[PDB]
Design a protein around this ligand. Structure first.
Ligand SMILES: C#CCO[C@@H]1O[C@@H](C)[C@@H](O)[C@@H](O)[C@@H]1O
Ligand SMILES: C#CCO[C@@H]1O[C@@H](C)[C@@H](O)[C@@H](O)[C@@H]1O
Ligand SMILES: C#CCO[C@@H]1O[C@@H](C)[C@@H](O)[C@@H](O)[C@@H]1O
Ligand SMILES: C#CCO[C@@H]1O[C@@H](C)[C@@H](O)[C@@H](O)[C@@H]1O
Ligand SMILES: C#CCO[C@@H]1O[C@@H](C)[C@@H](O)[C@@H](O)[C@@H]1O
Ligand SMILES: C#CCO[C@@H]1O[C@@H](C)[C@@H](O)[C@@H](O)[C@@H]1O
Ligand SMILES: C#CCO[C@@H]1O[C@@H](C)[C@@H](O)[C@@H](O)[C@@H]1O
Ligand SMILES: C#CCO[C@@H]1O[C@@H](C)[C@@H](O)[C@@H](O)[C@@H]1O
Ligand SMILES: C#CCO[C@@H]1O[C@@H](C)[C@@H](O)[C@@H](O)[C@@H]1O
Ligand SMILES: C#CCO[C@@H]1O[C@@H](C)[C@@H](O)[C@@H](O)[C@@H]1O
Ligand SMILES: C#CCO[C@@H]1O[C@@H](C)[C@@H](O)[C@@H](O)[C@@H]1O
Ligand SMILES: [Cl-]
Ligand SMILES: [Cl-]
Ligand SMILES: [Cl-]
Ligand SMILES: [Cl-]
Ligand SMILES: [Cl-]
Ligand SMILES: [Cl-]
Ligand SMILES: [Cl-]
Ligand SMILES: [Cl-]
Ligand SMILES: [Cl-]
Ligand SMILES: [Cl-]
Ligand SMILES: [Cl-]
Ligand code: NA
Ligand code: NA
Ligand code: NA
Ligand code: NA
Ligand code: NA
Ligand code: NA
Ligand code: NA
Ligand code: NA
Ligand code: NA
Lengths: 344, 344
């Protein structure tokens, strides 16, 4: 097991609007969209993209601006659905085959080819990619081996090499990387040690370093980073303290200051932020109240403000966002959302 | 002729630092680099990349983070130099051939292939591209025809299609675009009318629209935009008033509010910005003082603040930046810079 997961995936679209994707009580993927590219825009309300899924659905934006949603099907294959043109109609659901046992994780290579990562039937890391920029057809499936016990997360280094993070059978954070951008040649697996009790969360800092966050054995929020832009040595593990009861979420403020969010022991949303600037020391933890039943999902909107989403006690998706002074009151976006994560 | 040009090219690097590139009294390309990814970082001092150039040198970042600098050579061919690895050593200068009669303009396609645009010996628009993502060899040159009378400027639409802007023989703003992302198929030329007396300056908005700024026949700053995300019809020309004596520079604040900069009749730096939000009305023009002998160059740094560069009365490069309350006083980065613009 791992800490409680995020309930939605979110994207800031090609036209600057937030769109959130989750799973309904009918096992379809539903989505909810800002009308306008601003903090506090009205929302569409929940709308179904149909299908029947058995993982968290994960939205990604192609390099031509088209949204694409990936999810495990009822046959355990990887399935996907995409906008046929930027901000336009959706394709039918289509299978990418395989047999997967985690949520999918997606990134664009430097050549615009989406690459998708998931755990396999064998508990190894597997991957598949677009054969040309922002387009099918897709490659055959292949394995990066290893044996992993969390959902994988992928990011891109500031030199263009993809890098994947996952928990190992010893509960340490492990990782593996492309040897060159767009490459099919990957490193050996390497351990970054620690004991982690959530999915890892990875972000790129303003200064080009990968930084990984995860709940520890003591239920504190911990992090570890590349000390040099796209390069080792990594730092030691460092504690940001707290006691958290979900996976964390991390986003960059307007000024690049990292900010981490998680559910607290009182089930409120809590957060801690870098102070002064993006190189800065982290603040003490502070509560944003509420009573939540998922990990939070954080994202920076087109006004440069953080917006945080979490499921509530009524199973609706609730929302709060940064204002000048403070944070806004929690508001409900309604709906009934379930946690369909393929690893819990 | 066109309004006075910018003296440097600037990039916010893969690791978050500002680096500026200009032409020294020896006609070599020189550069100056922030040590750290923060407003008010100390600078390296000017350092030479050698070469002998007869255009403004134009820096662009490959999709793998490697800087690449483009410039017209003493033989009028397009020349370039690149980092051999991200943020590391530089190649030798190499020729991409052709005969060009403007500064070069560069954008990355959605497939990661850089494409460069320049006016040719025939006065038409020409282009050349990398044949694979962030790598040579380059394609053959081809023409998009037209007859142009300014430096061209390229940008990417929110659906991934490159689009190029230039002044025509009638002094109107003309443009031309890819019919699909990464394509060798382009539109016919189309006129956006108006009378322009500077190079056009293009930026993408938070909501995915191309917006173009130019000095008008009355020496006011004018602009015009796509009405629908990545699509015509375009707006009317609208005036932002002022009386300006250089090319404008435009950048996005970290909340996406556009902000334009230009030298005034008194040779000081002046600016006007969007208020409220990125969909807000523009402020009155305000002075940032200084006495400057080039157009200003504006860029957002890794603290989310705008920084503006301009040549001074002593031919050094000077710098002011946004602060909480105000703007910083002008500071000198030293050096002696010449205006090597191919079109004056
Ligand atoms: C519109 C609407 C809201 O619908 C609710 O929320 C959706 C996300 C689904 O769970 C539906 O089954 C449920 O009824
Ligand atoms: C076409 C289509 C959609 O298919 C549904 O949704 C897919 C994601 C799979 O779960 C299929 O097994 C299921 O029938
Ligand atoms: C080298 C290597 C691969 O290691 C495997 O996969 C890693 C991710 C860990 O789970 C190890 O405990 C396991 O043996
Ligand atoms: C190629 C290569 C090397 O990759 C880098 O250096 C490795 C030794 C690891 O520290 C990775 O996190 C990092 O991306
Ligand atoms: C250290 C600290 C901050 O607070 C702790 O961690 C927070 C996230 C909450 O869980 C509190 O209930 C708990 O006391
Ligand atoms: C404070 C507040 C807002 O409301 C609380 O937190 C929300 C996220 C919901 O769980 C409500 O049911 C709960 O009452
Ligand atoms: C070091 C240094 C600064 O050098 C000055 O500024 C450079 C940009 C060149 O013009 C040199 O010729 C001049 O001497
Ligand atoms: C190699 C090299 C450097 O060459 C100089 O700089 C290049 C950019 C060209 O102008 C050459 O013609 C000139 O000789
Ligand atoms: C069609 C076409 C191209 O038109 C040419 O190129 C345009 C950019 C203008 O300069 C016209 O005045 C000129 O005739
Ligand atoms: C394909 C296509 C259409 O291109 C768009 O629509 C055209 C009519 C122009 O407005 C361009 O500025 C824009 O890029
Ligand atoms: C006001 C001010 C700061 O300085 C002025 O503007 C600078 C940009 C230089 O031109 C100086 O030589 C001049 O004195
Ligand atoms: Cl609804
Ligand atoms: Cl379907
Ligand atoms: Cl993540
Ligand atoms: Cl700290
Ligand atoms: Cl944005
Ligand atoms: Cl010369
Ligand atoms: Cl070549
Ligand atoms: Cl050629
Ligand atoms: Cl421009
Ligand atoms: Cl930045
Ligand atoms: Cl000069
Ligand atoms: Na769009
Ligand atoms: Na966006
Ligand atoms: Na295979
Ligand atoms: Na990721
Ligand atoms: Na970064
Ligand atoms: Na950057
Ligand atoms: Na460097
Ligand atoms: Na451009
Ligand atoms: Na945009």
């Amino acid at each position: 097991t791992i800490a409680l997961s995020e309930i939605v995936s979110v994207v800031n679209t090609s036209d600057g609007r937030l769109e959130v994707f989750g799973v309904g009580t009918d096992k379809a993927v539903w989505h909810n969209r800002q009308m306008a590219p601003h903090t506090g825009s009205p929302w569409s309300g929940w709308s179904s993209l149909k299908g029947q899924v058995t993982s968290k659905p994960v939205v990604y934006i192609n390099t031509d601006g088209r949204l694409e949603v990936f999810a495990r099907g009822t046959d355990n294959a990887l399935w996907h659905i995409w906008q046929t043109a930027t901000n336009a109609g959706w394709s039918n659901w289509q299978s990418l085959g395989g047999v997967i046992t985690s949520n999918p994780a997606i990134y664009a290579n430097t050549d615009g080819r989406l690459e998708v990562f998931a755990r396999g039937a064998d508990n190894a890391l597997w991957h598949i990619s677009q054969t040309t920029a922002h387009s099918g057809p897709w490659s055959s499936w292949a394995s990066l081996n290893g044996v992993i016990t969390s959902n994988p997360t992928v990011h891109i280094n500031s030199d263009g090499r993809l890098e994947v993070f996952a928990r190992g059978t010893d509960n340490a954070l492990w990782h593996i990387w492309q040897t060159a951008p767009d490459s099919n040649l990957w490193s050996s697996w390497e351990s970054l040690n620690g004991i982690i009790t959530s999915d890892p969360v990875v972000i790129d800092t303003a200064d080009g370093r990968l930084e990984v966050f995860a709940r520890g054995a003591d239920n504190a929020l911990w992090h570890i980073w590349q000390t040099i832009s796209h390069s080792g040595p990594w730092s030691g593990w460092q504690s940001l303290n707290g006691v958290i009861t979900s996976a964390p979420a991390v986003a960059k403020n307007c000024d690049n200051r990292l900010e981490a969010f998680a559910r607290g022991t009182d089930n409120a949303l809590w957060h801690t932020w870098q102070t002064v600037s993006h190189s800065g020391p982290w603040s003490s933890w502070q509560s944003l109240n509420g009573v939540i039943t998922s990990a939070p999902t954080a994202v920076r909107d087109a006004d440069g403000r953080l917006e945080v989403f979490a499921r509530g006690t009524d199973n609706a998706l609730w929302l709060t966002w940064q204002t000048a002074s403070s944070w806004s009151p929690w508001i409900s976006l309604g709906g009934v959302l379930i946690d369909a994560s393929a690893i819990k």
